[PDB]
Design a protein around this ligand. Sequence first.
Ligand SMILES: *[C@@H]1O[C@H](CO)[C@@H](O[C@@H]2O[C@H](CO)[C@@H](O)[C@H](O)[C@H]2NC(C)=O)[C@H](O)[C@H]1NC(C)=O
Length: 302
Amino acid sequence: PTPILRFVAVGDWGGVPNAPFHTAREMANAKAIATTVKTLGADFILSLGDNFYFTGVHDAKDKRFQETFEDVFSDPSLRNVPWHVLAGNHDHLGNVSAQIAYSKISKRWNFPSPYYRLRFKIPRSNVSVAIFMLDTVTLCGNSDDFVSQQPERPRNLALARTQLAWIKKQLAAAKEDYVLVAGHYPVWSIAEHGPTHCLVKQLLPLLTTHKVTAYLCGHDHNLQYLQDENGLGFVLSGAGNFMDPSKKHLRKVPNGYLRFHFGAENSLGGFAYVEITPKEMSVTYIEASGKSLFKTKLPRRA
Ligand SMILES: *[C@@H]1O[C@H](CO)[C@@H](O[C@@H]2O[C@H](CO)[C@@H](O)[C@H](O)[C@H]2NC(C)=O)[C@H](O)[C@H]1NC(C)=O
């Protein structure tokens, strides 16, 4: 059997603050993800931010952890599937330290710090994968802090410079066969929010220089796949709770980069299913309805 590492990448699934604390879309995606894990399998699930709408959690004991997360992703197939989490802007309007601290309460919730590195060894093989989970809010600023709803500047300068330096160092030293970087804010996006200037300027150069396989993100509520002339992939998966068909920033993304987009208003949303083997990295976009909408693959690093 071909060695393989599999995981679900879902973003902006944070339900709602008012009863019942979830949306029809979040429930649909919970079911859809449970079906995919049940039939295709998944080693873990990656959350791309905006875990609890609209102002995160107050503390590690916030009832929202059970109402919006635990109780929602409760289907049998998801019982013991680990989640590796990072924060979004809405999470930062609340207590992120609380989401980090919740890791000690719920076994499947993994969120050791604002930004961290994940390392995986594809089973029955020597090919490795590294995933760098970033906190784009502390790095660029909280979009919610500005009327423009864009991260115009970080709240703390030392924190932002410190993370970037860490990214630079790590990406330079990374030797894995596959290197993924994940953050809430998008580098490229044709939707409502569009490209995050802070990431295009500070992160993208790094992604390129160090031949990262792909950048995974959420924030814009839809599904997109973009790839630049160097083959760098951009997996945007932020439709776990909402679906916005906005193409406002279509012209703000370099010509030809957009390879796939789905943001139908009537859709219940969707997510991305990543499969990594010694041969390649495949990314399948699946609608909450269970249907595959698009699939592509990325090569391993030299
Ligand atoms: C953010 O959340 C953290 C974690 O829930 C809060 O810190 C806890 O506060 C209790 C108060 O009784 C302490 O006994 C715990 O030791 C703290 N836990 C940790 C992990 O530090 C914190 O108060 C919250 N901050 C804000 C501003 O709401």
